[PDB]
UniProtKB/Swiss-Prot annotation, chain C:
This is Crossover junction endodeoxyribonuclease Hjc. Keywords: DNA damage, DNA recombination, DNA repair, DNA-binding, Endonuclease, Hydrolase, Magnesium, Metal-binding, Nuclease. Changing K49A: 1000-fold less cleavage of 4-way junction DNA. Binds junction DNA normally. Its EC number is 3.1.21.10. The keyword Metal-binding applies. It comes from Saccharolobus solfataricus (strain ATCC 35092 / DSM 1617 / JCM 11322 / P2).
Length: 117, 120, 125, 115
């Protein structure tokens, strides 16, 4: 709620049209035709259950947006591109919380440079 | 609300990723293959569509920042109608108006408009 | 060439396996990016181009071939500005397609550090 | 050279971005973020010899790039690729492998890539 509110406020300061989810990604941020989808996670490994993962992947696929995991850790705000997660044998999604990711400033720099995965 | 629910469900049937606003946020945000559609629910009073300045400014700003296409979703039973925001006239005071025969797009025509944009 | 050499040397200093495109290639058809830099599964592709009377022009057949190499490889394509001073890299997606299919860079891009950090932060692991 | 040209053409038919290069592998082939590296080498009585100098440089390129290293057998007919790990290192540090070590065909090289 507080981390999520801070992310929404900081994306808005950078010129994004932002909405929170009321299957649906937690944050949807839009700028100059660029769609960013954020799923908030609290972890010391990142785990996304099959049903949640499938729904957000489907929303990402349909929207044509870029999906990221928002990994909130005390003193850390890292966005992990969904494609970096490993699909387990039963369809869950995993990655180490120390995997290379983006901080907020780099994510915004990524949107402006017109770069998506 | 029932019209809004029906619009969300019908856009979902057409392959759109749809979210309802939880306000300077459009009521419906529909996304398909990189295309952004924004729908503000507005009822037709005395055959007129009348969007007050404050509401219009907030939704026009969300549309500008996002790079999305803005429409007014007609809050009516029956056949779904979507009015492109650009067909409305900005008044002297900054309000936005649509008369009686400013006919809106039906759902199929809106989807065909998105498809043409998707393929661009 | 000095700018190209400066880019190759700095990418090598950052731990990249770097290769130049052969003079025995880029034959209008099947063009190969000028610089291919690889680091533990991360592919960076740079096409060198000079600033002429303000803009940067990439001919249709050259642009199409480098876009296709980038798409097939899964690499990130950039235009390396052939100018003195600050190494500037323009993401290929920022270029606009003209009426005839040529590509133009108007007026600002990434410096070397930003390119590297952003691309590695995006696809590494 | 004809074998090298044929390898480049077949990889291109399979959707790879290929550079027939100018300590750099002869062929660098890229597909969906996957790096394949091919060093062209002749057979001598069913054996492929790689001088410690050349071997070290191509191993270093493969380590830095994160790519998979193979020896492309210079022979007519069916394309054969020997994974560099199949190279038995010698007393002097030189790398040796048998030309019939059951080296991969082109499809098996493409499959390792689609994984």
């Amino acid at each position: 709620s507080a981390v999520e509110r801070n992310i929404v406020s900081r994306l808005r300061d950078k010129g994004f049209a932002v909405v929170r989810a009321p299957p649906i990604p937690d944050i949807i941020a839009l700028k100059n035709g660029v769609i960013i989808l954020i799923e908030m996670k609290s972890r010391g490994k990142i785990y996304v259950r099959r049903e949640q993962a499938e729904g957000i992947i489907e929303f990402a696929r349909k929207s044509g947006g870029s999906l990221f995991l928002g990994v909130k850790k005390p003193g850390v705000l890292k966005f992990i591109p969904f494609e970096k997660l490993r699909r387990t044998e039963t369809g869950n999604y995993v990655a180490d919380s120390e995997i290379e990711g983006l901080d907020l400033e780099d994510l915004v720099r990524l949107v402006e440079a017109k770069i998506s995965r």
